Write an enzyme that holds these catalytic residues in place. Structure first.
Site, mmCIF file in Angstrom:
data_model
loop_
_atom_site.group_PDB
_atom_site.id
_atom_site.type_symbol
_atom_site.label_atom_id
_atom_site.label_comp_id
_atom_site.label_asym_id
_atom_site.label_seq_id
_atom_site.Cartn_x
_atom_site.Cartn_y
_atom_site.Cartn_z
ATOM 1 N N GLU A 72 1.592 0.635 -6.586
ATOM 2 C CA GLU A 72 1.294 1.699 -7.524
ATOM 3 C C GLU A 72 2.136 2.916 -7.157
ATOM 4 O OE1 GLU A 72 -1.009 3.535 -4.383
ATOM 5 O OE2 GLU A 72 -1.038 1.405 -4.939
ATOM 6 N N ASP A 124 0.811 -1.205 0.000
ATOM 7 C CA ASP A 124 0.000 0.000 0.000
ATOM 8 C C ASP A 124 0.856 1.270 0.000
ATOM 9 O OD1 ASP A 124 -2.806 1.075 0.323
ATOM 10 O OD2 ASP A 124 -1.908 1.953 2.115
#
Length: 609
Positions: A341, A298
């Site tokens: 990401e 995350d």
């Protein structure tokens, strides 16, 4: 007691199995007396006691400090499931009673007492493991799920939660029906606040007791593997929950965190070698002990860059940590799937570390998500000017190994669910939803969708509730989930779609300048097979829309997003088309296709030899 010593790799930031020494473990002392040994790293502490029910939560048992800063101790006779904590006498004179940072089991929140637990689970998934693959050239169709809010027990919030075993029994049939290949679980590391969803972690090695015991979770993974389903664990290496009795100020100094940011968290200090080992070992736990098939990490941009901003500088300590983490995970589990990401696009996230990448397998395509949702939120009348908002994604697509994700983060906090983001009437939202996911599944790149997306959910996600399963009493929602399953089926079975997704030679634009019509068309050409994909994003039909081909060919319809069976408005009968001679220069053949308003169609292409 000869207490085991942790490997020197711990102090190098290179230890991936620190939990084999640290934590609480069954053993015998030198006199053959059964008990449990304890070890905790707390180098600045002046004293530590093992505390628990065994002495009625009194002074406990003094631990002995090695010159490594690892404290060790033994308590005879304790049974699995008994509660314990460490009383830490800190460098600063503080006294704090804490959960074992390497607890394997924790009481149900709000309690934080650690529980003695064995970590040797029976699995029968060796053939699953032998077959395991990163899926570069296989379907990867991930169902992102929060374990407490997918489905609840009949009657009942909490206690109305299924146990991990019961969750597997209920979930796996749904996954199989919709051709999801993997479930990605929101973080199951122990956490105090249900509404953090697992992203404010206190117990990195302690699978959350909300849904049962360690063996229950292990059984969940084992069950998935028996049925051919993979399990990806979400992981939070950037920061930890700021609770004063968890990791912060651990030994009376800033040990886990920097000496000197997201609300209610503390950032991990990657320049502390033992913190790197902690995180290495926390990620590896899921792969090792629980047989997970991957890790999604995350908010990695908040680690990669100081204050999450490349203009403030790259955090080279973070970069090295993540490179080493991915290296070690691949060394031990090369067929695991490791994702993240980084919407800054500053560093090379999925390039090999050898070429100055960070060494992840896949990167969520945040640009694709934002641009696509922006586009379908646009009034029909303004779409011509915004046409290339959709084509842009293929301009940069091959720069990383991109994964098309519509995640939990996009359907919360007043942002609206996917369908509710779209412009127009109920009927227009519904038609466009079918086309949106058509686009998602026929654009190259692996897939991730948060639970509820497949239902066309209108209500934003609330972790206190289960999905609105009653939606399937309504034709739109019921037919939509079947449509979603059909996209999954096509994706999983058609080589054109799943093989060679990251090969630029497998993608070809056919119509990418039709601004007035809002029509886009392309070929997917995986494994030398051809599928034509065409979508209408305008709210009017197109009659005999011309698509120019370099060769004559037949086209057989595989999908029509506006078919009656998906609650769509089209009732056309023709499924078999063929080119006519004559097109444009370089493309002297025309395939003419009727496009329902807001509708998409997929065709198997058979060249005429």
């Amino acid at each position: 007691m000869n207490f085991p010593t942790i490997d020197r790799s711990f102090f190098a930031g290179e230890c991936f199995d620190a939990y084999r020494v640290l934590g609480a473990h069954p053993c015998r002392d030198d006199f053959g007396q059964e008990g449990w040994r304890f070890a905790v790293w707390a180098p600045g502490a002046v004293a530590v006691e093992i505390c628990g029910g065994f002495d009625g939560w009194g002074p406990g048992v003094p631990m002995q400090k090695a010159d490594t800063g690892v404290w060790s101790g033994f308590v005879p006779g304790l049974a699995e499931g008994e509660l314990y904590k460490y009383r830490i006498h800190g460098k600063d004179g503080s006294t704090v009673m804490r959960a074992d940072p390497y607890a394997f089991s924790t009481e149900l929140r709000p309690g934080t007492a650690s529980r003695l637990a064995r970590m040797d689970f029976a699995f029968d998934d060796s053939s699953w493991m032998e077959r395991r693959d990163k899926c570069r050239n296989l379907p990867l169709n991930i169902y992102e799920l929060h374990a407490g809010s997918w489905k609840h027990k009949p009657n009942a919030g909490s206690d109305g939660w299924y146990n991990y075993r019961e969750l597997a029994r209920e979930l796996i049939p749904w996954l199989l029906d919709h051709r999801f290949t993997h479930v990605e679980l929101l973080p199951l590391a122990e956490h105090p606040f249900d509404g953090s969803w697992g992203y404010q972690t206190t117990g990195y090695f302690s699978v959350t007791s909300r849904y049962g015991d360690p063996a229950d979770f292990a059984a969940f993974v084992n069950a998935c593997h028996r049925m051919g389903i993979g399990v990806i664990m979400d992981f939070v290496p950037v920061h930890f929950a700021a609770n004063g009795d968890a990791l912060a100020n651990f030994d009376g100094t800033h040990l886990y965190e920097y000496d000197s940011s997201e609300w209610g968290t503390c950032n991990f200090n990657y320049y502390r070698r033992e913190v790197c080992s902690f995180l290495n070992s926390a990620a590896a736990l899921w792969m090792d002990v629980y047989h997970c098939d991957g890790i999604r990490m995350d908010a990695i941009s908040r680690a990669l860059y100081w204050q999450g901003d490349p203009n403030r500088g790259v955090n080279e300590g973070a970069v090295t940590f993540l490179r080493n983490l991915n290296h070690g995970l691949n060394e031990r589990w090369p067929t695991g799937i490791y994702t993240a990401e980084d919407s800054t696009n500053f560093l090379k996230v999925t390039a090999p570390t050898r070429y100055d990448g960070i060494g992840f397998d896949y990167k969520w395509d945040m640009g694709w998500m934002h641009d696509t949702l922006d586009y379908f939120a646009t009034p029909f009348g303004e779409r011509p000017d915004a046409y290339h908002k959709l084509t842009f994604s293929m301009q940069y697509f091959y720069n990383e190994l991109y994964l098309l994700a519509l995640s939990h983060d996009e359907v919360v906090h007043g942002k609206k669910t996917i369908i509710d983001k779209l412009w127009g009437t109920y009927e227009e939202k519904c038609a466009q939803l079918r086309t949106l996911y058509f686009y998602m599944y026929t654009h190259p790149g692996k897939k991730l969708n948060f639970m509820g997306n497949e239902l066309g959910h209108f209500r934003e996600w609330d972790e206190k509730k289960e999905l609105d399963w009653g939606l399937m009493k309504y034709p739109f929602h019921d037919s939509f989930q079947k449509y979603f399953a059909e996209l999954g089926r096509l994706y999983a079975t058609e080589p054109a779609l799943y093989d060679g997704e990251y090969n630029p030679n497998c993608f070809e634009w056919i119509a990418c300048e039709s601004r007035d019509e809002g029509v886009y068309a392309w070929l997917r050409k995986g494994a030398g097979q051809t599928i034509l994909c065409v979508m209408n994003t305008q709210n009017t039909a197109h009659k005999k829309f011309p698509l120019y081909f370099q060769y004559p060919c037949a086209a057989d319809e595989l999908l029509n997003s506006e078919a009656a069976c998906w609650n769509g408005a089209d009732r056309s009968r023709t499924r078999h088309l063929h080119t006519t001679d004559g097109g444009v220069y370089g493309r002297d053949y025309t395939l003419s296709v009727d496009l329902p308003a807001m509708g998409s169609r997929m065709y198997r292409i058979t060249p005429e030899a």
